[PDB]
Write a protein that binds this ligand. Structure first.
Ligand SMILES: *Cc1c(COP(=O)(O)O)cnc(C)c1O
Ligand SMILES: *Cc1c(COP(=O)(O)O)cnc(C)c1O
Lengths: 374, 374
C-alpha cells in the first residue's frame, strides 16, 4: 500500500502529555481549560470573545439561532452552494431559507454576484472561506452595512488564514471555526464561535449550556432554552496544545503546497489554486481544477488516483443538488458552482506530509492525468 | 479543607492507557471505537441498538425529534417536574409542550397520577429514573399501550440499574443515558440512545451526523437534516474502558450508600431513600429527605454543610418554576413536587468515596441537623 488520506490529524508528545494531566484531574468538563482555550483563541485572532463547542455544526446552529431573533418576514439568508452541507443544514434548522449565490474560480462566494439576490426578506449573508482562502471581506462588509444585513462567516477551513495581513475571525459579526480531526488544528471533534459583540457572546454562551444562569451554589435560573454543546476539558487541553503550534502546522502545509506548485507548474491538465493566493492561507485543502475536457471521466480519474494510494476527495458537491434541497426548493443549477464541482479535486495536504511523499503524490497525479489521452 | 463534591469522575490506569492509544491513532473520530462502545452497551443492556452522542441533551433532542414526526395536534408530552431542566428544554426545542405530572416520595413520576392528564393531544410520556431508581415500568408500559402513547425514558441517572432483575434501557421505546463527568460512568461529556427499534435507530443515526448517506468514497446523499452530535474516538475509548468496570463502580456506590444507611437509620431529622429500594440502583445520587419542620431554614443547613466541606446539592428544582416555564404556561405548583424539592438533599456519593470519608460525612450531616434545634 502506502495510502495518503486527504488530511489527517497531527498530534505530538506535547498534545498527549497535555491530555494526560487532564485525565488526572477531578475536573473533566466545565473547567478552567476551555476558558483558557477560549482566551488563547482571542489572542491568536485578536478578537474580543471566543466560545468553544462540541462541533462546528453546533457552533453554526448556535450562531444562526442567536445573532438575531427569528422573524418570518426576514427569513432569507444568502450563502454559497460550495461548502459542507452543515453550513446550510443549520440554516434550515434555524428557520432560514438558504439563497444560493454564484461562486468564483477560487471556490469562494462571488461578492460581485451578491447584491441582485437581496430583497426585503434577506436577513444575512453566510460566506465560507473555501480551502482557507479568505473571501472578499471588505466588499461583503460594505454590502451588508449598506443593506442592513448581518455578515456571518463560516471560517471552518480558515483558522490562521489572513486577509490584508489581518487574521480571519475578526471581520464578520461572528465567525465559526472547526477543530474536527482533519482541520487546521484538532480537538477530535470541536468548534468555536468568535465575535466582537458581547451581547451575542453572552446569548450564545447560555444557549451552549441549558440556558442556566447561576444564583448561589444551590440554584439556577432559566429564561430561555439551551443545549449541551460544551467542549470538555480533555479536548480543550488538546486544543490549547494544538493552537500553540498552529502557525507551525500551517507552515508545514504551506511548504507541502509550494512543492505541489513547483511540480504542477505549467502542466497541461489542471490548474492548482495555491499559486493564486494573495494572503496567507491555513491551507486546509490543496485543490486543483481540471480542464473542461476531463470532466466527463472524472470518476475514472478518482478511481485511478485511489488505486495509487492517493485517497483524493471532492469539495464540494453543490448543496442544492442534495435530494433534500431539490425537494424543498427546486433550485436552478448555477453554472459557476456546477463547473467548479466537476473540476475540483483536493489532494493530500496536512502537516505530516513530508517532502518525499508530496513529490511521489505530485508525480503520480500527473502520470494519472496523462494516461487519459485527450 | 477536605471538600467532598456530591459526585466526581473515577478514572484509573486502564482508562488513561485506553485514551493514550487513541491519541497514537490517525483515527480520532468516526472510527472503530464508538461502534465498539455501542456494541458493548447493547450487551451490557441486552438491547438491540445503541447510539452514542456528545451529550445526553443531544441524545434527548435526537429522540424527541425522531421517535415520530411532529403533528401540531399531538403536541403534548407528559413528564416529571423533578429532573434536570434538559429533559424539558429538549421537549420545547422539538415543538412539544411539557405536561407536568405529580411525583411520589422517591422522586419518581407518579404512575398512578398519569392517566387523568391524557387528552387527544397527548403524544408521549417521558419518565426519569430519579437517582437511578427505576420508575414503575410495567404500569407505564400499559398506560401507553392502552392510550396509543409513546413511552420515552430519560435514564441518565440509571445505567446499570435494574427493574425486576432486568437492566434499565430495554423497557421504553427508547432510553437515554448520560456519561457526563459525574454520572455512573463517564466520557467527560457524552450520552447515548438505546432502543429495540431499528427504524428509530437508523433515523437517529443519520440525525446525529448531517443526515449524510454514502454512495461511494466520493459522494453522499442528504434526504433530511442532521447535526454533528458524534462522540469522538478518545471519549469512546474512555467509555468502553469505563463500562467494563461499570458494575464495580456501581457496587462502590452501593457500599457507600449502605454505610450512610447504617449511620442514618432511625435518625429523627430526615429519611434516606436508599433503604427503600426494591431493585439494584446505579446509585447516581444518595438523596435524603428532610422533615417538614426543617424546610424553612434549608438554606442555612446547606451553608452549614458546605462549611464542613460537604458540598451538598439539591436535585431538583421543579422545572415549572424556571422563569421560562412560568412565562410560557403559568403552571400551577404541584404539592408533591414542591414538598420533595424543599426536602431533598443529595449527599456525596461516587465510586471513590472510601469508608472513612462516608462515616465522617455521615456524622457531620447529623451534627449539622441537630445544631438547628426544633
Ligand atoms: C466540516 C465543516 C463544517 C462542519 O463542522 P464540524 O466540526 O465537522 O462539526 C462546517 N463548515 C465547513 C465549511 C466545513 O468544512
Ligand atoms: C445531566 C442529565 C441530563 C443531561 O445530560 P448531559 O450529559 O449533561 O447532557 C439529562 N437528564 C438528566 C436526568 C440528567 O441528570
Amino acid at each position: 500500500m502506502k495510502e495518503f488520506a486527504y488530511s489527517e490529524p497531527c498530534l505530538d508528545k506535547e498534545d498527549k502529555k497535555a491530555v494526560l494531566e487532564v485525565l488526572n484531574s477531578k475536573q473533566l468538563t466545565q473547567g478552567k481549560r476551555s476558558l483558557l482555550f477560549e482566551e488563547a483563541l482571542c489572542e491568536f485572532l485578536g478578537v474580543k470573545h471566543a466560545l468553544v463547542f462540541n462541533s462546528a455544526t453546533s457552533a453554526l446552529l448556535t450562531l444562526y439561532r442567536n445573532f438575531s431573533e427569528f422573524s418570518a418576514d426576514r427569513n432569507e439568508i444568502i450563502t454559497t452552494p460550495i461548502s459542507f452541507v452543515a453550513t446550510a443544514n443549520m440554516l434550515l434548522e434555524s428557520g432560514y431559507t438558504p439563497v444560493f449565490a454564484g461562486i468564483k474560480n477560487d471556490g469562494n462566494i462571488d461578492e460581485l454576484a451578491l447584491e441582485k439576490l437581496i430583497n426585503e426578506r434577506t436577513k444575512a449573508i453566510v460566506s465560507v472561506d473555501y480551502a482557507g482562502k479568505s473571501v472578499e471581506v471588505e466588499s461583503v462588509q460594505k454590502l451588508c452595512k449598506k443593506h442592513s444585513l448581518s455578515f456571518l462567516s463560516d471560517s471552518s477551513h480558515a483558522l490562521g488564514s489572513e486577509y490584508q495581513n489581518k487574521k480571519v475571525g475578526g471581520f464578520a459579526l461572528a465567525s465559526v471555526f472547526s477543530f474536527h480531526a482533519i482541520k487546521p488544528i484538532t480537538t477530535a471533534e470541536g468548534g468555536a464561535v468568535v465575535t466582537n459583540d458581547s451581547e451575542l457572546h453572552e446569548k450564545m454562551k447560555l444557549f451552549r449550556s441549558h440556558g442556566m444562569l447561576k444564583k448561589d451554589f444551590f440554584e439556577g435560573e432559566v429564561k430561555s432554552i439551551g443545549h449541551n454543546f460544551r467542549l470538555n476539558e480533555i479536548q480543550s487541553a488538546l486544543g490549547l496544545s494544538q493552537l500553540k503550534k498552529a502557525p507551525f502546522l500551517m507552515q508545514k502545509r504551506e511548504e507541502a503546497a509550494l512543492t505541489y506548485d513547483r511540480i504542477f507548474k505549467d502542466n497541461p491538465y489542471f490548474t492548482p489554486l495555491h499559486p493564486l493566493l494573495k494572503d496567507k492561507s491555513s491551507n486546509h485543502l490543496y485543490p486543483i481544477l481540471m480542464h473542461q475536457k476531463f470532466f466527463t471521466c472524472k470518476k475514472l480519474i478518482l478511481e485511478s488516483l485511489h488505486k495509487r494510494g492517493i485517497l483524493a476527495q471532492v469539495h464540494y458537491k453543490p448543496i442544492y443538488q442534495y435530494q433534500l434541497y431539490q425537494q424543498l426548493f427546486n433550485t436552478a443549477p448555477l453554472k459557476s458552482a456546477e463547473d467548479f464541482y466537476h473540476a475540483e479535486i483536493s489532494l493530500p495536504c496536512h502537516a505530516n506530509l513530508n517532502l518525499e511523499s508530496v513529490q511521489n503524490i505530485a508525480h503520480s497525479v500527473l502520470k494519472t492525468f496523462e494516461s487519459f489521452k485527450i
